[PDB]
Each structure stands twice: as C-alpha cells, then as structure tokens.
Design a binder for this molecule. Sequence first.
Ligand code: MG
Lengths: 118, 133, 132, 77, 86, 101, 113, 195
Amino acid sequence: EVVIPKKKTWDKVAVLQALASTVNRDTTAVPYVFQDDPYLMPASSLESRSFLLAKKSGENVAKFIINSYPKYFQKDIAEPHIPCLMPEYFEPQIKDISEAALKERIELRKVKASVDMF
Amino acid sequence: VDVPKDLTKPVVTISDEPDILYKRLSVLVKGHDKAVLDSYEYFAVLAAKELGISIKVHEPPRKIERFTLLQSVHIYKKHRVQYEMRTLYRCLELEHLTGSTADVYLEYIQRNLPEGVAMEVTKTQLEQLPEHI
Amino acid sequence: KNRAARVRVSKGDKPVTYEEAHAPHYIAHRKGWLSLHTGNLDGEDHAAERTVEDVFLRKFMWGTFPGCLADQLVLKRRGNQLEICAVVLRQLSPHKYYFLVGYSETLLSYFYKCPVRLHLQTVPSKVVYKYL
Amino acid sequence: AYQVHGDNWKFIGPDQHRNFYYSKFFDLICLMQIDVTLKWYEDLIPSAYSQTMIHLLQALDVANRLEVIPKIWKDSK
Amino acid sequence: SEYAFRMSRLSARLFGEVTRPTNSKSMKVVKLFSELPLAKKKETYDWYPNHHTYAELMQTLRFLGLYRDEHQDFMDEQKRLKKLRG
Amino acid sequence: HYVDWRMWRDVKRRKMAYEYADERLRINSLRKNTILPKILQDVADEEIAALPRDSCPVRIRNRCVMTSRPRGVKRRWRLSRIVFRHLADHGQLSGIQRATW
Amino acid sequence: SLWDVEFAKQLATVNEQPLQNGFEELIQWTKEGKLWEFPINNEAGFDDDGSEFHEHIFLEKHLESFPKQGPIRHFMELVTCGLSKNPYLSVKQKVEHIEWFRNYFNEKKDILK
Amino acid sequence: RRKALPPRTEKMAVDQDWPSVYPVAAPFKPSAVPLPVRMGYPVKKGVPMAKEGNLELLKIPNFLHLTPVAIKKHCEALKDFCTEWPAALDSDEKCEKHFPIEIDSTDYVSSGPSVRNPRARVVVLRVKLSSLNLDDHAKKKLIKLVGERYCKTTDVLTIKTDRCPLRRQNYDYAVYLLTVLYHESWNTEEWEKSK
Ligand SMILES: [Mg+2]
C-alpha cells in the first residue's frame, strides 16, 4: 500500500566523526594547533614545547582574569547559556555552619575545612 | 605510505518510527557577490547530483537599498553623498526528498556555507489526516 | 575637492598599501570589505551590534599586537564561527606572538561567548602598493 | 615496528614519550633498501621532529644513495 | 445582516478574537497587549553595550600593561607637562 | 564611562522606561479604554500623573553610540551619519558601496 | 561517587591529547556545545517550560471570579485576546498580568457600577 | 635575527591530496598554497601584487577547500548514510493523494553568536476541500466562515499560524483548530438554517 523509510537518530558529534574519518591525516604538515606561516612555524621540539606552553600560560592568565573580575563577563549575551563560558565562583558565603559544610565539598581546599571543624 | 587500516565509522540506529517525508525543500541564498553565489550554487548542485536527487535553478532579481547622507559636516544641504547595499538572491528547489537525506544534506551545506551569505529554508512536508477529524 | 579615506599626493616619499592607496568609491569595484557578515542584508538584524563589536575587536587587537601589524584586518564570521586574519612583521619573538594569540583568543571567546579563532601571516617588511 | 604502528593515538600524550617513540621508530627503520624508509620519512618530517639524523646518515651511507643526503641536511638546517 | 454577524461571531470564537462587538478604543487593549511596548523592546533595553564595562576593562588591562593605549599615553604625557609647567 | 552626562541621562531614562514599561502599558490601557467608568479613567490618569519623572518612553532619544550625536542617526545602525560615512569609506563594515547608479 | 569521579577525571586527563585537524576542533566545539547543532531550529533550548498552545490562548481557566456580562468581563476578555495574539510572552507572564488586574480591581472594588 | 623557512611550494609535489591538506574552511595561507594566483589592480605597465602580500585574496571569501574531488569523496562517504525516497511517490497528484495535508515552516540563518529570531515561529498549511469534506452543508458552512483563507481558482484552503512563539505550539494549535473547525462545521444552528 505505502512504503515509508524508517527514522534514525544521530549524535551531534557523530556526523562530524564521519566527516573526519572520511579524510586522512594531513601529510607533510605540522599539527593543526601550530600556525601555518613559516616564521611562526615551530621548527624544533624544545621551541614547540615552549610555544604551546606559552599558549597554555595564556589560557591560565585568561582563567585568572575571569575569576578575578567575573562581573565583566557576567553578561549572558549568547542565547545558549554555557557554564563553561560563565565566570568561575570559589567564594565562601556568610557564616553558616550547615551551608558552609555543604559548601566545603564545593570549594575544594583545606583551610575552610579546618575552620569548619573548629 | 601511512594509510589507515580500518576507518572507524559512527554508529547509526534505525528508529522503529517512520521518517518524515519532505515534499519540497526550497533554499534561498542572499549574498553580495554574484560570483560567490554562483560558486555556492555549483557546489550545492554537484552535491545534490552526487547524492542522487532532483534539482532546479533560477536567479531571482537583484534588490537594492540606498540612502543619502550629508557629504560635509556643518552647512551643505545640496552636496550629498549616496550609498547602497545590493542583495542578490539565488533559489534552489529539491523535490521528493527523505527526512534523513534532508538532515544530512542541510548539515553538510550549513557547515560548508561561506561567510557573507544568509540562508533561508522553506520546508514543505505532506501528512495524512488526523484521527479526530 | 573630497577628502575621505585617501592619501595626499606627496613628492614620492610615502609608501602606501593597496587599501590605503585606493579610494573609498573604489571599494566594491577594486577592493573587498574588511568584515563579512549578514546583518547588513535584508531581513537580518543586530547589524549595529556587529559593527560595534567588530570595531572594538579591531582596536583591542591592534593595541594588543602593537607595532607588528602593517595593514587592516580580515574578519570572517560564518554562522557562529568567528575567524580573524592578520598580516604582521617578525619584530618580536614567536613566544610572545603565540602567548598574545592565546591571550586574545581566550579574552574574545569569554567576552563574546562565541567560538573565535585567528590566523597571522608573517612578512619581513610591509608590502607597498606605490610610493606617492 | 609495523605491527606496533581507531582512536588509539591518544595514549602517546606527553611530548617526551612521543619523542622517544618516534626516535626509536625511525632508528629501527634506518638500521633495518631504504627507499620506502625515506619515503615514510619525507612524508612525516613536517609533522615529526641529532641522533636520528646520525642514524639517517649512516643508513644513507650503507645504502650508497649519495644524492639524498644534501636534501636531508638542507631540511635539518 | 444577522446571518453574517453570527458568522463573524463564530469565526471570532474559533480564531480567538472577540465575538461580541467592540470599538477601536476597546481594541486598543487587544493590540496593546498583543504587541509589546517600545520600552520593553530589546532595542530600547540595550541601545549599546556599556562603555562602563569597555573602559573599565581597558583601563584595568592597561594597568596590567598589555594594551599600549596611544591616546592614554598622549593624555598622560600632556597632563605631566601641564602639571610641570603649572 | 559613558561619553557624557547627556548620554548618562539618556541611559537612565531608557532603564527607567524599561523597568516601568509594563506598568505604564497596563495603566495606559486602563485609561484609554472606553466602556469602563470615567471615574476609573480619571483614577488611572491621576495614577499616571503621580508616576515618577523620566519613566515615559518619549523623553528618551535615539542618540548615537559613538559620538553622542542625536540628529543624523539611522535607527538600523544606530550610528551617526559622519561615523557611518567614515566606516563605509574605510571599508570597516560589510556590503556597502557608493551609489553610482 | 566522589572517588569515582576522581578516577574518571584522572582517566580523562590521561586520554586527552592535542588534536591535529579542524574537524577535531569542531568536534570539540560541538561536544562542549558552543558550535550550533545543525539543523538550526532556532529553538535548541528555550522550550517555554513545556508550555502548551491552549495554556497560552484559552484563559477561561484563569477567568473565574467575575460573571460574563460586565465591563470588567469586557476588559479582561480583551486582555486575554491580546495576550493570546502575543507570542512574545508566555503563560507565566499572562497569569501575572491577570493576577495584577485581579489585585487592582479587588482593591478598587469600591464602585462596582 | 631569526629567519623564516621558505614556503611549502617547492615541498608539495604534483601528486597531492588537496582534500586532505585542506579538510575544512580556512584562509588562503599563501605559504602553504603553491599557486602563483595574484589579484589586484596593476599599475601602468605593472602587475597585480604577489600572493604573499595579497591580502585581498583573504578579503574575498575562500573556496580552496571543498574541491570537486573532496565533494565527490564526501558524497561517496555519506551515500551509505543518506536514505532513499519511495518510488511510489513520483508525482504531485500521487503524493497529495497519499498525504493531502500540506504543511510548511521556515527560518533564516545568519552569522553571529545568537541564533533565536522570532520569524522561526511562523508556519502555514494547506488542504484542498475537493476530496476531504465529503459533504455539501458543512462545505458551504466552512466556505462562509473562512473569509480569504481559500482560493477557488486553484481550489486550496490555506491557513497560517503565528500566535505562538514555538514551532510545535503553532503546529499542534493549527491541528486542534482544524479539528474543532471540522467538528463545528459538522453541526448547524437554527439561525443558520434560516437564511
Ligand atoms: Mg562634491
């Protein structure tokens, strides 16, 4: 009478996994993390190590600035709210032994725990 | 010489429910460069051909919006300067296209868009009558 | 006599680039736009926001890569993705270059809540279109 | 070496371990014709990173392929 | 006609609008609560992103010492010269 | 750090009209309605009159963002004519050319 | 659960490595969710708390405390009409509107003329 | 002090996997690109500027990626993933017979961080009353109720839905509206009998 193809469900990453497996690794080319121009082209192991370590240090500097001044990036301009992009909050609340104890496992340190045991 | 042995493929599952049937997918690209629009059109039509689906092509007219500004700063009413934005349309219709084919093709094309172009989908799907009617 | 994004003819002692040389009324005929977005087209919106944010980005990146650039930038906004392209000189160390690259990338990403990435092309000395 | 060679390439990780692996790999390949070896090499040199070049030089010597050493020295330089 | 009046009443009951007759001063309520006000529009809500955030960020980052603000350098040097010369 | 005190006042007015937007809408509907009591219309009118200043969305002005110029500004771009011409000539923004038609 | 997630993050740190392709970069962006999921419905998130068309449009359930003849009925019917015509605001906003109206005319119940 | 290595032009061979060396969208990168393609208005007895300083190739949109070979490769890869259309549905009369109720929605996509835009909510649908009503009294009643939603030249009843912001809200509200409309056109009234 009528034939209908059945529906399927995919992961958002599965399509791009297919696209990536379609293509092999780039030949005669440094990693994608490194730039393409020849001057910035890291041409040795030690200097490349130092380079991507400087990049990671910039990442840590970004973390430091964001967690030091959260109110600047507090605006959620993007329509999809993302905690990965939201600023980070390791701020102890007001004196409250029960909520402070619940926040212990959230702050991930030891001075708060000493003070709470006290 | 470095050729992989076994290419890992993503998992695919055929859900028990039926797939939706798109009657016609009409895509409209608004651009600034006729050459970019032509390249994008060749890309899309070749992709649709290699996927094995129907296609038609036509070039709607060019639309323009222009406006006059004061050429100088303080006192010059007769001396003005004009400006205009030109938007060029290109429409493409795909007929008798399955839902999963639509999803994969639109994902591909949307990832392979160029920058200075806007893309407008009109999806047209058929359905039988409800059960309350 | 019109003075708008053009160079004054000198004795021949003024190196000028392609963009800085050509006139603004030559922009669509013999140039491209520094930005590429769809807010200007019909039906879209947030064009004012696009322009404000891209101007601020240009200023911030010019001042956080000072003395190394020699021309205007190329912005390429594909849907969500934001791509920057710059041409710079080999003044400072690649250490500093990559450090500032990562720094600006992280700042732009956290500020705009948008996937940002940039490319930079090295030149020994800034290219010149003519000597006016 | 060919046997030791889906997403199992994440277990390399640190640049030090990657360096040791690639070094020993290319060393074994040099001290194994060497046309296929230099093919693999000239393929992976940009992706890949003194001892390896020494082994390359002695392999090229035992091979007698004199014309190849110049390009290798130029690449290293 | 009464027939067309009741036809309109039925169409109104179906599509949401009022069946009972109504004046323009009363449909004022309808369209006012249909379209939100200019004050509530996002364009009036955010006419531009805050120079507060922008300038505070750039000032703090200059104090960090990464953005060589040429205009700020200029202003500072001329302020120094002014306070030197009186 | 807004450009100037008039921009400050404009933004204050914008935020006041926003945070009193729905209230003003409701009471203005209650005023302009016709079948309801005229005494109720007068009640709502006195309420609007007692509402604070700088709360109406008419006192605001669509001023410029860069140079704070009220006149010669496009509602779409929100930029003054001078700065718009500057950016268009320098090619900063996308898809505008000279109308040589 | 605690030591479980500790071991899980340890294994994660052991796995993670630098990518070598823009396809992998995009896979990363998608798996953290910054990259848009095509098809673009313009509604990935913001589902209005599973609200319903009838909850938006049919306000007779929220109209209880007045008969169906008076001018208050006229006004509130016009309010429900305009709200149903408005898509921008949801059932929460509409019930807040009608609740403020209830409060208003119940505080100004002096007249009832 | 330090000098930049020469570009990949001499390095890249004539036999080369361009789909592999340019997998995704990326800028021109003349150091990696071997082509001498130049672009720029030449001076009198001059030439366009070389690719190294030709930032206008970067200004223009980029299509070095996604070569015809790459497109063929990706289509051959996704052929196993894409499905087939029913062969029975090969004509408009047949497809509208199998599924008379036409329905279509739409939305734009634009470059930027935000993705929401109210035009996502609007939808429309169509159905011809030639075969669905199966009666005359309810048909006359329905055509008297609807003012401009019909068209007898093409003989299709079309209706739009935008009252709700959500696409599925619009969809199911249109469905419920059509259902109640049919159920109310089924019956009649005494003032309706009197005409
Ligand atoms: Mg003139």
